[PDB]
Amino acid sequence: NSEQQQTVFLCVSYLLSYPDEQWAESLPDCLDAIRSLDDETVRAPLLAVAEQLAITPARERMEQYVETFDFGKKTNLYLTYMEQRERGIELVALKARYEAAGFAVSDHELPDYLPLMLEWMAYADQEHTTALLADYAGHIREIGDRLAAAGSPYAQLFDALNHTFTQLGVTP
């Protein structure tokens, strides 16, 4: 269903965010939201990640987050990093696409930030979400493959993104 996909986008977007103490206040709600997913292919990996984080001290969640998603590594969650001027041109175009679905991109986060893009896809129509996916699915899958090659527990979230994407019509 569509609302199940919205749920996947919201939960992954949240689970890819910096896991400080304020973030953890929503982990119970996130754990319930995940458990309402019917499809085991996306429910199990989302559940594995959320449950592992729930037993991990905040200091270690934040440590591993920074050492996994550092701006220096290729696994950073900003898609235009995979040359500032060309980056900025792409950012102009991405921001215009967001407004094409009826969403005013705030000038406080970069439009290529994966958790932001995921949150947008939970609110956008299938047509706009799929058009965006066709362009950036490759970026997203490569982040997963890099995480998977580094043995990061966060790579499981991307397994769920894969299945969700192929369900929308986006195969690699």
Short mmCIF file of the C-alpha atoms (twelve columns), coordinates in Angstrom:
data_MODEL
# 
_entry.id   MODEL 
# 
loop_
_atom_site.group_PDB 
_atom_site.id 
_atom_site.type_symbol 
_atom_site.label_atom_id 
_atom_site.label_alt_id 
_atom_site.label_comp_id 
_atom_site.label_asym_id 
_atom_site.label_seq_id 
_atom_site.Cartn_x 
_atom_site.Cartn_y 
_atom_site.Cartn_z 
_atom_site.pdbx_PDB_model_num 
ATOM 1   C CA . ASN A 1   0.000  0.000  0.000   1 
ATOM 2   C CA . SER A 2   0.964  3.665  -0.238  1 
ATOM 3   C CA . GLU A 3   0.608  4.447  3.461   1 
ATOM 4   C CA . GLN A 4   2.977  1.573  4.245   1 
ATOM 5   C CA . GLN A 5   5.555  3.184  1.963   1 
ATOM 6   C CA . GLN A 6   5.015  6.528  3.702   1 
ATOM 7   C CA . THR A 7   5.686  4.682  6.963   1 
ATOM 8   C CA . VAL A 8   8.941  3.226  5.616   1 
ATOM 9   C CA . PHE A 9   10.107 6.664  4.487   1 
ATOM 10  C CA . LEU A 10  9.319  8.343  7.807   1 
ATOM 11  C CA . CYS A 11  10.898 5.618  9.932   1 
ATOM 12  C CA . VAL A 12  14.085 5.315  7.876   1 
ATOM 13  C CA . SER A 13  14.398 9.112  7.703   1 
ATOM 14  C CA . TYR A 14  14.176 9.182  11.506  1 
ATOM 15  C CA . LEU A 15  16.553 6.244  11.976  1 
ATOM 16  C CA . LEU A 16  19.167 7.950  9.781   1 
ATOM 17  C CA . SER A 17  19.097 11.075 11.954  1 
ATOM 18  C CA . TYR A 18  21.654 11.977 14.614  1 
ATOM 19  C CA . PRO A 19  20.657 9.753  17.583  1 
ATOM 20  C CA . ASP A 20  21.031 12.131 20.531  1 
ATOM 21  C CA . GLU A 21  18.790 12.086 23.621  1 
ATOM 22  C CA . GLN A 22  16.047 14.239 22.087  1 
ATOM 23  C CA . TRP A 23  15.973 11.834 19.132  1 
ATOM 24  C CA . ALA A 24  15.445 8.883  21.488  1 
ATOM 25  C CA . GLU A 25  12.209 10.415 22.785  1 
ATOM 26  C CA . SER A 26  10.572 9.299  19.527  1 
ATOM 27  C CA . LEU A 27  12.078 5.803  19.448  1 
ATOM 28  C CA . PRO A 28  9.117  4.173  21.281  1 
ATOM 29  C CA . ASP A 29  6.714  5.734  18.762  1 
ATOM 30  C CA . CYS A 30  9.044  4.684  15.951  1 
ATOM 31  C CA . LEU A 31  9.183  1.122  17.289  1 
ATOM 32  C CA . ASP A 32  5.376  0.973  17.262  1 
ATOM 33  C CA . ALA A 33  5.182  2.487  13.778  1 
ATOM 34  C CA . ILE A 34  7.592  -0.138 12.431  1 
ATOM 35  C CA . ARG A 35  5.594  -2.966 13.996  1 
ATOM 36  C CA . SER A 36  2.535  -1.950 11.962  1 
ATOM 37  C CA . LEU A 37  4.314  -2.812 8.705   1 
ATOM 38  C CA . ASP A 38  2.896  -5.925 7.060   1 
ATOM 39  C CA . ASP A 39  5.746  -6.693 4.663   1 
ATOM 40  C CA . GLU A 40  8.472  -8.541 6.551   1 
ATOM 41  C CA . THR A 41  11.046 -7.565 3.902   1 
ATOM 42  C CA . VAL A 42  11.025 -3.963 5.149   1 
ATOM 43  C CA . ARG A 43  9.688  -4.562 8.674   1 
ATOM 44  C CA . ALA A 44  12.433 -6.878 9.946   1 
ATOM 45  C CA . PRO A 45  15.486 -4.748 8.984   1 
ATOM 46  C CA . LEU A 46  13.837 -1.548 10.222  1 
ATOM 47  C CA . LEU A 47  12.991 -3.350 13.461  1 
ATOM 48  C CA . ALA A 48  16.505 -4.757 13.861  1 
ATOM 49  C CA . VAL A 49  18.070 -1.293 13.620  1 
ATOM 50  C CA . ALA A 50  15.596 0.477  15.912  1 
ATOM 51  C CA . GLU A 51  15.848 -2.257 18.538  1 
ATOM 52  C CA . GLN A 52  19.652 -2.278 18.506  1 
ATOM 53  C CA . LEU A 53  19.698 1.489  18.987  1 
ATOM 54  C CA . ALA A 54  17.209 1.254  21.867  1 
ATOM 55  C CA . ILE A 55  19.710 -0.750 23.964  1 
ATOM 56  C CA . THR A 56  22.730 1.380  23.006  1 
ATOM 57  C CA . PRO A 57  23.867 4.282  25.228  1 
ATOM 58  C CA . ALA A 58  23.387 7.697  23.646  1 
ATOM 59  C CA . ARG A 59  27.121 8.417  23.763  1 
ATOM 60  C CA . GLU A 60  27.788 5.296  21.684  1 
ATOM 61  C CA . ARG A 61  24.922 5.886  19.250  1 
ATOM 62  C CA . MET A 62  26.317 9.340  18.540  1 
ATOM 63  C CA . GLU A 63  29.920 8.112  18.351  1 
ATOM 64  C CA . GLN A 64  29.127 5.397  15.828  1 
ATOM 65  C CA . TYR A 65  26.887 7.785  13.889  1 
ATOM 66  C CA . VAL A 66  29.690 10.329 13.432  1 
ATOM 67  C CA . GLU A 67  32.280 7.669  12.599  1 
ATOM 68  C CA . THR A 68  29.859 6.084  10.096  1 
ATOM 69  C CA . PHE A 69  28.376 9.149  8.378   1 
ATOM 70  C CA . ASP A 70  31.295 11.575 8.668   1 
ATOM 71  C CA . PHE A 71  31.430 14.285 6.018   1 
ATOM 72  C CA . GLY A 72  34.822 12.845 5.065   1 
ATOM 73  C CA . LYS A 73  33.575 9.332  4.326   1 
ATOM 74  C CA . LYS A 74  31.753 8.333  1.155   1 
ATOM 75  C CA . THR A 75  28.773 7.234  3.266   1 
ATOM 76  C CA . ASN A 76  27.783 10.780 4.220   1 
ATOM 77  C CA . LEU A 77  24.052 11.353 3.822   1 
ATOM 78  C CA . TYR A 78  24.382 14.291 1.379   1 
ATOM 79  C CA . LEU A 79  23.811 12.932 -2.115  1 
ATOM 80  C CA . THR A 80  25.398 15.731 -4.163  1 
ATOM 81  C CA . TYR A 81  28.806 14.900 -2.712  1 
ATOM 82  C CA . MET A 82  28.814 11.847 -5.025  1 
ATOM 83  C CA . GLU A 83  33.390 20.804 -7.185  1 
ATOM 84  C CA . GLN A 84  31.315 23.175 -5.066  1 
ATOM 85  C CA . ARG A 85  29.809 25.110 -8.003  1 
ATOM 86  C CA . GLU A 86  28.388 22.028 -9.722  1 
ATOM 87  C CA . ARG A 87  27.085 20.820 -6.350  1 
ATOM 88  C CA . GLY A 88  25.315 24.142 -5.872  1 
ATOM 89  C CA . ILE A 89  23.789 23.976 -9.347  1 
ATOM 90  C CA . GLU A 90  22.399 20.530 -8.567  1 
ATOM 91  C CA . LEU A 91  21.098 21.863 -5.237  1 
ATOM 92  C CA . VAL A 92  19.232 24.635 -7.078  1 
ATOM 93  C CA . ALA A 93  17.579 22.070 -9.332  1 
ATOM 94  C CA . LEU A 94  16.726 19.695 -6.490  1 
ATOM 95  C CA . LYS A 95  15.103 22.494 -4.489  1 
ATOM 96  C CA . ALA A 96  12.942 23.406 -7.485  1 
ATOM 97  C CA . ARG A 97  11.786 19.789 -7.778  1 
ATOM 98  C CA . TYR A 98  10.626 19.798 -4.149  1 
ATOM 99  C CA . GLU A 99  8.502  22.874 -4.806  1 
ATOM 100 C CA . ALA A 100 7.084  21.081 -7.863  1 
ATOM 101 C CA . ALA A 101 5.292  18.684 -5.489  1 
ATOM 102 C CA . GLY A 102 3.984  21.533 -3.321  1 
ATOM 103 C CA . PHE A 103 6.661  21.815 -0.636  1 
ATOM 104 C CA . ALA A 104 8.645  24.912 0.310   1 
ATOM 105 C CA . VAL A 105 12.183 23.730 0.987   1 
ATOM 106 C CA . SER A 106 13.536 25.506 4.050   1 
ATOM 107 C CA . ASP A 107 16.870 27.287 3.738   1 
ATOM 108 C CA . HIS A 108 18.169 25.540 6.866   1 
ATOM 109 C CA . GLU A 109 18.905 22.046 5.518   1 
ATOM 110 C CA . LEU A 110 20.487 21.075 2.249   1 
ATOM 111 C CA . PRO A 111 18.046 19.483 -0.230  1 
ATOM 112 C CA . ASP A 112 20.430 16.591 -0.947  1 
ATOM 113 C CA . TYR A 113 20.326 15.414 2.682   1 
ATOM 114 C CA . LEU A 114 19.004 11.851 2.546   1 
ATOM 115 C CA . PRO A 115 16.810 11.946 5.694   1 
ATOM 116 C CA . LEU A 116 15.253 15.148 4.369   1 
ATOM 117 C CA . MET A 117 14.603 13.648 0.932   1 
ATOM 118 C CA . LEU A 118 13.088 10.548 2.538   1 
ATOM 119 C CA . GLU A 119 10.745 12.676 4.651   1 
ATOM 120 C CA . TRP A 120 9.671  14.566 1.527   1 
ATOM 121 C CA . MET A 121 8.859  11.303 -0.267  1 
ATOM 122 C CA . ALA A 122 6.485  10.320 2.551   1 
ATOM 123 C CA . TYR A 123 4.436  13.455 1.784   1 
ATOM 124 C CA . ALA A 124 4.702  13.633 -2.013  1 
ATOM 125 C CA . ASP A 125 2.509  11.997 -4.622  1 
ATOM 126 C CA . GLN A 126 3.654  8.725  -6.163  1 
ATOM 127 C CA . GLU A 127 4.338  10.506 -9.459  1 
ATOM 128 C CA . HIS A 128 6.734  13.061 -7.954  1 
ATOM 129 C CA . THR A 129 8.299  10.539 -5.584  1 
ATOM 130 C CA . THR A 130 8.938  8.073  -8.404  1 
ATOM 131 C CA . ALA A 131 10.403 10.738 -10.704 1 
ATOM 132 C CA . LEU A 132 12.802 11.773 -7.951  1 
ATOM 133 C CA . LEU A 133 13.638 8.129  -7.198  1 
ATOM 134 C CA . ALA A 134 14.534 7.366  -10.819 1 
ATOM 135 C CA . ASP A 135 17.218 10.050 -10.552 1 
ATOM 136 C CA . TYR A 136 18.597 9.404  -7.050  1 
ATOM 137 C CA . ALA A 137 17.956 5.696  -6.355  1 
ATOM 138 C CA . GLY A 138 21.474 4.945  -7.589  1 
ATOM 139 C CA . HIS A 139 22.967 7.427  -5.124  1 
ATOM 140 C CA . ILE A 140 20.970 5.870  -2.302  1 
ATOM 141 C CA . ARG A 141 21.826 2.266  -3.175  1 
ATOM 142 C CA . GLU A 142 25.532 3.093  -3.339  1 
ATOM 143 C CA . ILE A 143 25.406 4.510  0.194   1 
ATOM 144 C CA . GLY A 144 23.910 1.206  1.295   1 
ATOM 145 C CA . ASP A 145 26.564 -0.825 -0.510  1 
ATOM 146 C CA . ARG A 146 29.274 1.261  1.123   1 
ATOM 147 C CA . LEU A 147 27.649 0.825  4.532   1 
ATOM 148 C CA . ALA A 148 27.223 -2.892 3.831   1 
ATOM 149 C CA . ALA A 149 30.880 -3.158 2.787   1 
ATOM 150 C CA . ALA A 150 31.834 -1.454 6.070   1 
ATOM 151 C CA . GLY A 151 29.703 -3.865 8.112   1 
ATOM 152 C CA . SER A 152 27.478 -1.107 9.486   1 
ATOM 153 C CA . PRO A 153 24.141 -2.021 11.081  1 
ATOM 154 C CA . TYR A 154 22.708 0.998  9.236   1 
ATOM 155 C CA . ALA A 155 23.025 -0.885 5.939   1 
ATOM 156 C CA . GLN A 156 19.888 -2.885 6.809   1 
ATOM 157 C CA . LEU A 157 17.775 0.253  6.422   1 
ATOM 158 C CA . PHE A 158 18.933 0.394  2.807   1 
ATOM 159 C CA . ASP A 159 17.862 -3.201 2.204   1 
ATOM 160 C CA . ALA A 160 14.384 -1.972 3.086   1 
ATOM 161 C CA . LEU A 161 14.744 1.067  0.830   1 
ATOM 162 C CA . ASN A 162 15.679 -1.302 -2.012  1 
ATOM 163 C CA . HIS A 163 12.531 -3.400 -1.654  1 
ATOM 164 C CA . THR A 164 10.424 -0.257 -1.297  1 
ATOM 165 C CA . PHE A 165 11.970 1.245  -4.435  1 
ATOM 166 C CA . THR A 166 11.524 -1.862 -6.586  1 
ATOM 167 C CA . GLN A 167 7.897  -1.855 -5.422  1 
ATOM 168 C CA . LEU A 168 7.503  1.673  -6.800  1 
ATOM 169 C CA . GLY A 169 9.052  0.577  -10.107 1 
ATOM 170 C CA . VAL A 170 12.761 1.389  -9.557  1 
ATOM 171 C CA . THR A 171 15.038 -1.611 -10.099 1 
ATOM 172 C CA . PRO A 172 18.865 -1.283 -10.329 1 
# 
